[PDB]
Amino acid sequence: CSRLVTETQYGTMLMRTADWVSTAPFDGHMSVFPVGTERTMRGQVAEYQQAMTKWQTKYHTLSIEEHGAFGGLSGQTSNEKGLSVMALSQHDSEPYLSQHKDNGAPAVNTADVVSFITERYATTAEVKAALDNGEFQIAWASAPNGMEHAAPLHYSVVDADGNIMLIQLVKGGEQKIYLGDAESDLRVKTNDPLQEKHREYMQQFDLKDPSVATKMPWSIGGLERNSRLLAMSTHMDLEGLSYTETVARQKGTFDAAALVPFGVQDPKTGEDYPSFFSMQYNLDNGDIWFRSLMSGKEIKFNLEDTKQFKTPMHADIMAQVDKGAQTITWSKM
Amino acid sequence: CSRLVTETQYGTMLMRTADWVSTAPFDGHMSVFPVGTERTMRGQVAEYQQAMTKWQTKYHTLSIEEHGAFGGLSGQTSNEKGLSVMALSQHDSEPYLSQHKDNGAPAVNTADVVSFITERYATTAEVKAALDNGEFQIAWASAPNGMEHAAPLHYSVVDADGNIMLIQLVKGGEQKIYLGDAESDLRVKTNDPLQEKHREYMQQFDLKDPSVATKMPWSIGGLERNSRLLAMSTHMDLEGLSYTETVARQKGTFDAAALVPFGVQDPKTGEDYPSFFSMQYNLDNGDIWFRSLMSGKEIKFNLEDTKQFKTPMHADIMAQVDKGAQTITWSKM
Numbered sequence: 001c002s003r004l005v006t007e008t009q010y011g012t013m014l015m016r017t018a019d020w021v022s023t024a025p026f027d028g029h030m031s032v033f034p035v036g037t038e039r040t041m042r043g044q045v046a047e048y049q050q051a052m053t054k055w056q057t058k059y060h061t062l063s064i065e066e067h068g069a070f071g072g073l074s075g076q077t078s079n080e081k082g083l084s085v086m087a088l089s090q091h092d093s094e095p096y097l098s099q100h101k102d103n104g105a106p107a108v109n110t111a112d113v114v115s116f117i118t119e120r121y122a123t124t125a126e127v128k129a130a131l132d133n134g135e136f137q138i139a140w141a142s143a144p145n146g147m148e149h150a151a152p153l154h155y156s157v158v159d160a161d162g163n164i165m166l167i168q169l170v171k172g173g174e175q176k177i178y179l180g181d182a183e184s185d186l187r188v189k190t191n192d193p194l195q196e197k198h199r200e201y202m203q204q205f206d207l208k209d210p211s212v213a214t215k216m217p218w219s220i221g222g223l224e225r226n227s228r229l230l231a232m233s234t235h236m237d238l239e240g241l242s243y244t245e246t247v248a249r250q251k252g253t254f255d256a257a258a259l260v261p262f263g264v265q266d267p268k269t270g271e272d273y274p275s276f277f278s279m280q281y282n283l284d285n286g287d288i289w290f291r292s293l294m295s296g297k298e299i300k301f302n303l304e305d306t307k308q309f310k311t312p313m314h315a316d317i318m319a320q321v322d323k324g325a326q327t328i329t330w331s332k333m
Numbered sequence: 334c335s336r337l338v339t340e341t342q343y344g345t346m347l348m349r350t351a352d353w354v355s356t357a358p359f360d361g362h363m364s365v366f367p368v369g370t371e372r373t374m375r376g377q378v379a380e381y382q383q384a385m386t387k388w389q390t391k392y393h394t395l396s397i398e399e400h401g402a403f404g405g406l407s408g409q410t411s412n413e414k415g416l417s418v419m420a421l422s423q424h425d426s427e428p429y430l431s432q433h434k435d436n437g438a439p440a441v442n443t444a445d446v447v448s449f450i451t452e453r454y455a456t457t458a459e460v461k462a463a464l465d466n467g468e469f470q471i472a473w474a475s476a477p478n479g480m481e482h483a484a485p486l487h488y489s490v491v492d493a494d495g496n497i498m499l500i501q502l503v504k505g506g507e508q509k510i511y512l513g514d515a516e517s518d519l520r521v522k523t524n525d526p527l528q529e530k531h532r533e534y535m536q537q538f539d540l541k542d543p544s545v546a547t548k549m550p551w552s553i554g555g556l557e558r559n560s561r562l563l564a565m566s567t568h569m570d571l572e573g574l575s576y577t578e579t580v581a582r583q584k585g586t587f588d589a590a591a592l593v594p595f596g597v598q599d600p601k602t603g604e605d606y607p608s609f610f611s612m613q614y615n616l617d618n619g620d621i622w623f624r625s626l627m628s629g630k631e632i633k634f635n636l637e638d639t640k641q642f643k644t645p646m647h648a649d650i651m652a653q654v655d656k657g658a659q660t661i662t663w664s665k666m
Contacts, residue, residue, distance in 0.1 A: 210598040210605075218551040235596030244655070248629030252608075253594045261589035262582065263568030265543040272543075275585075296581030324577075 001088035002225050002258035003189045004233060005158050005182040006250050010243045011284030012162045012182060014084050015254045016076055017275040020069055022262060026276040027068035028290070028318040031333065032306045033057045033119055041112055042072070043145030048107035052116065052136055059083070061118040062288070062303055064279060064317075071146040074115040080303060081122040082160030082283040085114045090154035090168065092192040097150040099173025100140035110153060111145035113138050117157065124163035128177065131167075140169055156189055158182070160283040170194055188229040190258075191222030198226045207234045213257075220266050220273050228257040247289070251280060259293070277318055295322040306330075334421040335558045335591035337566060338491050338520040339583050343576045344617030345495045345515060347417050348587045349409055350608045352524075353402055355595060359609035360401035361623070361651035364666065365639045366394045366452055375405075376442035376478025385439035385449065385469055392416070392455060395621070395636055396448040397612060397650075404479035407448040413636060414455040415493030415616040418447045423487035423501060425525040430483040432506025433473035443486060444478035446471050450490065457496035461510065464500075473502055489522055491515070493616040501527055521562040523591070524555030531559050540567045546590075553593045553606050561590040580622070584613060592626070610651055628655040639663075 003016040018026050033039065037057040045051045059079035065072045076086045087110070108116045116136065121127045130136060144151050155167040162182035166189065170176045178195055180186035185199065201223060205212055213231035218224055232253050238246050262274045280289040286303035299321055305328075306313070313330040320329060336349040353359050366372065370390040378384045397409035411417045420443070441449050449469065454460045463469060477484050488500040495515030499522060503509045511528060513519040518532070534556060538545055546564040550557055569586050571579050595607040613622040624631035632654055639646070645666040653662060 210596060211600045213597050214552045214600060216551070218549070219547040232594055232597060235598075236594075237596055244628050244630075244657075248627060249595065251629055252592065252626050253596070255588055256592050256594035259585065259589050261565055261569075261586045263543065263570055263586070264546050264565065264589075265568075267544045267547060293585055294581065295577050296584055297577075 001191055002229060003086060003088060003156070004229050004250065004254050004258070005162065005164065005187040006233060006236070007162055007182045008238055008246050010246055011282040012082070012158070012160055013247065013250050014158055014281045014283060015250055015278065016086060017258060017260070017278045018066060018075065019260045019273050019275045021271050022274055024069040026066055026318075028277045029065045029067050029072070030315045030317045031063045031065060032309050032313045032330070033061045033063065033115065034309050034312065035060055037312060039119070041109055043109035043111050043142070045107040045109050045139040045142045047141040048102045048137070048139055049104060050106045052106040052108040055116060055119065057119040059119060059122060060303070060307055061115055062306060063115040063118070070151070071111065071144060073111040073144050073151070076279055077114050077118040078281055078283070078288070078303060079118040079122070080286075080307070083118055083122055083124075084158040084281060084283055085117045085155065087114050087153040087155050088189060089152065089191050090194070091152050092194045093154065093169040094152035096169050096171060096173045097152065098141050100169060100175065101173060103134060103137055105134040105137040107137050107139040107142070109139050109142060109145055110151055114155065122159070123161075124157050124159040124165050127157050128165055128179070131177070138167070138175075140173070140175070154189070158283065166195060168195055185230060187233065188226055190225045190229070193223060198223065202227060202230065205231065207231060210235045220260050220264055221268060225258045229254070232257045247280065247282070290317055290321060292318050292321045297321050297324060299326065299328065301328060334524060335562060335587070336419060336421065336489070336522045337562055337583070337587050337591075338495065338497065338515045339566060339569070340495050340515045341571055341579050343579055344615040345491070345493055346580065346583050347491055347614045347616060348583055348611065349419060350591060350593070350611045351399060351408065352593050352606050352608045354604050355607055357402040359399055361610045361625075362398045362400050362405070363648050363650045363661070364396045364398060365642050365646040365663070366390045366396065366448065367642055367644065368393050370645055372452070374442055375444045376475070378440040378442050378472040378475045380474040381435045381440035381470075381472055382437060383439045385441045388449065388453065390452040392452060393636070393640060394448055394451040395639060396451070401609075403484070404444065404477060406444040406477045406484075409612055410448050410451040411614055411616070411621070411636060412451040412455070413640070416451050416455055416457070417491045417614060417616055418450045418489070420447050420486045420488050421522060422485065422524050423527070424485050425527045426487065426502040427485040429502050429504060429506045430485060431474050433502060433508065434506060436467060436470055438467040438470040440470050440472040440475070442472050442475060442478050443484055447488070457490045457492040457498045460490045461498055461512070464510070471500065487522070491616065499528060503527060518563060520566065521559055523558040523562070526556060531556065535560060535563065538564065540564055543568045553597050553599050554601060558591045562587070565590045580613065623650055623654060625651050625654045627651075630654050630657060632659060632661070634661060
């Protein structure tokens, strides 16, 4: 899984891939939660003393759910204020999940927390304040809805002004929070190892050298995807480009750095890790592009298209894109 | 520039990128030459005793011409028999071009020779025989039409039964022809160095190891693109896929191996080499996909869609796709 934020003259652009082992193919769906929805949390958080059983949607939110392996967990969200939240795999947190300490805040099941944040908050600062004030916590130690074990994930929030927060569970069960903007190294997020280890790795590379990507090892792992996205995004020059050309430039650059093909095995895992789908967002204007790598097809839409919905709605978006749909078919939840 | 042939159950698939330095951006155009067209060669071939001044089109041919930097030279063609012909850059042939010896055959200016071959011949073996019999020769030592110097190019021919021919100008100005099928290493063609050197480089890598791509150096150079296309294609698994899925699998695999992003500089040249546009062909059925990397957009069409035309036609295809065209607007030449 990889994610890039790029500042542009047309908006803050975010691109994210959903990658997994080919033995358990992903299947992306979308849910829309309109303003004022009375929401009920999916799953249990029995490890924590207080549950976020119910909430109300404050901000119109679209949630991309992973149905193929993750049981419907919400992994990439955006709201009408241009806030984006996301969960990506972070296997190096696995040893520590059960050691997350309950601070007494209402705990949100990891199947829904990404959506819950979009539904409640408008800016990165708001979410960091809410965490600090004990408004909610992430239920790190609890299994996601319907799954057997706590999942090793790391979370991030990106707002329309390019403020980034990374939330990563590290040694001892510490919830570590990293802050930065879309020109910091936090504009890139992948998978394992943990963020300190990526930063250590990067110290040998001088990103100012436009030939530096050629000096970086290639692999399908999170380490190499992190380094290559950092290198290739440093030298991405968006001057004089149109909007369409700017979107395309991010896409192209991202794919060169981080699209994971089928058939390549990572010697560190003995497994593959192909990209199944991707999302591109303009957080300033609501533009969304959903691409399936299985069909190679993509649809462009806007969050505004769903703003008329008066009840939650759902779409098997990847399936529809794979069948050649040009518009989304929505169903009541 | 990179090119991949892949045998599939739905047909012989070919993918090719057109890559160049960013300081001279590419602009892809297309011409249609119907059967019976009286053709007049562009340019001169004054270094050669006999010129292919005029010929008649035998096979309905679509020619992809590069207008940005190569003055409208034909770089990628196909015909109604499924023959595909292409020219890619081969900078290691540059010191040898003036040493090519005129064999007395009618010489075809390099602006046209790729189209000429598709307009006259149906199979790879037919092209090989025509060369051997002296029916034409490449004007290696002559500048392409409208340009100052001989261009350092290499040529290849792929037919609908997957027979491949590579033509390179090697030390001392000798013309070397390699033959093989679409399972051989000739299924991949990039840029410098010459083929013997690519083969030498590849001896170190065991292509049967599915983790082998992770053991290969990455660069934007032809050497590294060759190696990675060979690796990634060796483990592409097309069983069970639909036709759409198969086309996409080739695309994505090719992109991971060989799509060159903007901004990365090659330390061997001190220049970049981004991909500007790409073409995908099914040689068995006439399907063609043209994608612009500048806009990210792609159109699908079929050669049969152009049999209606009784005189030559032309389209600024790249410009049209960049403006969001879904179908080609043809002009009389």
